């Protein structure tokens, strides 16, 4: 939550610029450079937030894809066990039959576990979306329009001052 703190220092610098241009009649280019610095720092902060978010998104999505790949491995193994049981049914060896069914049952248990972890990865993905996308970027955008409308209001006041 330090994004609003660094940006709050930035807009405090912007209000300092506003005061020093209001008192001693500074150049408009200084206020333009200040607003451009706020804009580029907001863009860099948004890029940092997006970089971290895409990093954890790649991590979460790669773990989810690893889970589906392991599910593919486990269903391939289950199909192999079913095929082996189907071939062994024609022979009449009943001792390995129970072992095969127990191995299929524990495959099914780990498959249900994989589904549970897939769900608890998906909702984590959704929450890590919504928290950052509702707090960070939106706070930056709101304060960005706030600071640029402060700059525009001061520029209108200066235009009124200069034409009289």
């Amino acid at each position: 939550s330090d994004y609003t703190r660094r940006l709050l220092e930035t807009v405090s610098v912007l209000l300092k610029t506003i005061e020093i241009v209001r008192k001693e009649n500074g150049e408009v280019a200084e206020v333009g450079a200040a607003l451009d610095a706020v804009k580029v720092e907001k863009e860099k902060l948004q890029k940092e937030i997006m970089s971290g978010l895409y990093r954890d998104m790649r991590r979460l999505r790669k773990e989810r894809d690893l889970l589906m790949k392991r599910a593919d491995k486990i269903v391939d193994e289950a199909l192999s066990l079913k095929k082996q049981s189907e071939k062994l049914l024609r022979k009449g060896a009943r001792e390995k039959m129970e072992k095969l069914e127990e191995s299929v049952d524990i495959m099914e248990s780990e498959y249900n576990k994989i589904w549970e972890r897939i769900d608890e990865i998906d909702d984590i993905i959704l929450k890590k979306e919504t928290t950052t996308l509702s707090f960070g970027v939106r706070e930056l955008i709101f304060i960005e329009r706030e600071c640029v409308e402060l700059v525009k209001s001061f520029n209108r006041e200066l235009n009124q001052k200069s034409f009289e």
Binding site: M50, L133, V137, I141, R145
Partner: protein
């Protein structure tokens, strides 16, 4: 879809200031065409 989320966040429509039905939208689209 890298910039699509930022585009979703950026849009400043929070001032509605509209103050009917989507059928009216269709007939007005025809009028505009």
């Amino acid at each position: 879809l890298i910039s699509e989320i930022s585009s979703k966040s950026l849009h400043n429509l929070l001032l509605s200031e509209e103050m009917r039905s989507p059928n009216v939208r269709e007939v007005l689209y025809s009028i505009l065409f």
